Amino acid sequence: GWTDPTEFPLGCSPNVTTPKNGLSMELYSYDYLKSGSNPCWDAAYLDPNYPRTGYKSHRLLAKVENVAGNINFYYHAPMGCTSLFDTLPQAYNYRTPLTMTNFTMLLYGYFKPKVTGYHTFTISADDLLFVNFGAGNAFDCCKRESSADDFGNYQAYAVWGSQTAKDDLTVHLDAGLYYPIRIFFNNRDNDGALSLTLKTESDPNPVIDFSDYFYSFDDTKDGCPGLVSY
Ligand SMILES: OC[C@H]1O[C@H](O[C@@H]2[C@@H](O)[C@H](O)O[C@H](CO)[C@@H]2O)[C@H](O)[C@@H](O)[C@H]1O
Ligand SMILES: [Ca+2]
Numbered sequence: 001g002w003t004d005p006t007e008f009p010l011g012c013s014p015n016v017t018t019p020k021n022g023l024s025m026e027l028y029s030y031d032y033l034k035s036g037s038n039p040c041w042d043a044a045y046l047d048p049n050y051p052r053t054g055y056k057s058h059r060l061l062a063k064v065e066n067v068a069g070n071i072n073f074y075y076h077a078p079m080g081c082t083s084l085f086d087t088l089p090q091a092y093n094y095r096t097p098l099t100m101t102n103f104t105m106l107l108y109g110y111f112k113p114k115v116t117g118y119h120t121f122t123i124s125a126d127d128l129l130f131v132n133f134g135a136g137n138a139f140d141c142c143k144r145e146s147s148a149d150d151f152g153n154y155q156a157y158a159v160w161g162s163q164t165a166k167d168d169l170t171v172h173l174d175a176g177l178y179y180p181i182r183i184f185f186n187n188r189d190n191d192g193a194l195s196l197t198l199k200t201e202s203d204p205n206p207v208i209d210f211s212d213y214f215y216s217f218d219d220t221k222d223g224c225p226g227l228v229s230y
Contacts, residue, residue: 002136003152009134011177012141013227020216022068023109027061030102040081041189051184055104066093070209075100075192100192105185109216110178115202122168126160126193128186138180142224176228
């Protein structure tokens with residue numbers, strides 16, 4: 001299947017004149033239910049289609065470009081079932097306070113490896129992190145806008161409180177190619193947390209700063225299929 005997740009994901013070969021650093025981000029509201037409710041949080045985030053089209057029924061907070069660096073955070077909420085304003089880490093390029101206790105966040109763009117070989121991406125989240133990776137699975141090469149909602153089965157997924165609250169994906173990548181990536185996050189209530197790390201054989205320690213790895217590219221009419229193949 002075109003959008004199915006694989007160990008040998010498809011990469012892309014855009015024209016790399018003045019390449020845009022970082023991923024794109026969209027932030028959406030995630031309102032609580034009526035004050036005093038039990039459960040207090042909106043349960044929409046667990047709906048299979050919330051990450052596909054459901055979030056679009058919420059309020060658009062911002063579109064942001066150039067998301068790059070260490071995107072990991074643990075936000076400790078002072079009180080539960082309470083909307084509280086605070087700030088994202090510097091990497092998100094978004095300085096104004098938002099409801100860190102309850103929000104939806106979409107990131108997309110391309111991952112560029114440094115060293116050809118196996119890559120293990122490990123994720124954890126509070127509440128939810130769904131990752132697509134590779135052309136088709138995330139979106140089509142330089143045809144993101146037209147394929148944005150057609151992402152396939154997740155490469156990795158983590159849901160707080162579920163039987164899979166931490167996950168990983170192992171993929172063989174070529175350093176010459178750029179791999180479509182989609183990261184969907186939700187905090188329903190209280191603490192919020194996102195951890196993405198990368199392990200390869202070239203470094204005994206994990207990579208947590210993705211400054212040099214995340215890119216954005218304009219769509220083109222014909223697309224930009226990968227020009228390295230084995
Ligand atoms: O532990 C993190 C986890 O809990 C959050 O809140 C619930 C809260 O609603 C309730 O008041 O207390 C319990 C335990 O004392 C939890 O703290 C969130 O619902 C959940 O998203 C997650 O962040
Ligand atoms: Ca939470």
